[PDB]
Amino acid sequence: NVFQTRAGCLIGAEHVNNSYECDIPIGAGICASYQTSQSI
Amino acid sequence: YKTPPIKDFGGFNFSQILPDPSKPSKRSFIEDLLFNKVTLADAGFIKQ
Ligand SMILES: *[C@@H]1O[C@H](CO)[C@@H](O)[C@H](O)[C@H]1NC(C)=O
């Protein structure tokens, strides 16, 4: 689940294509949340 | 709110400050000038 952003390399969270009111600010317009199995 | 679809405001010219859909950013001419004036120092966010 390696993902590349402009704030750094993120390991442990899968990348999606939707856009909601973001939960945890990562940076550079990228946020993260805990959703559904269960994952980040 | 989306930018106005038609431009008949009555003679007033807003193309100077409205965004131009010609560059990968939505910055107008004034915004581009203002960005070009001040220079940053962090040099991006990635330095391996
Ligand atoms: C990774 O290096 C490449 C150049 O080979 C560059 O396109 C990219 O900007 C670098 N990664 C980030 C997040 O900037």
CA distance A9 to A11: 7
Beta strands A2-4 and A9-11 are antiparallel
Atom of ligand 1 at shortest distance to CA of A6? 13
Atom of ligand 1 at shortest distance to CA of B44? 14
CA distance A6 to A30: 9
CA distance B21 to A26: 29
* Structural resolution in Å: 3.2
CA atoms within 13 A of residue A35's CA, in its CB half-sphere: 12
User: Measured on CA atoms in the order B35, B40, B45, B48, is the torsion positive or negative?
Assistant: positive
User: Which residues of chain A have a CB within 8 Å of the CB of B45?
Assistant: 6-7, 28
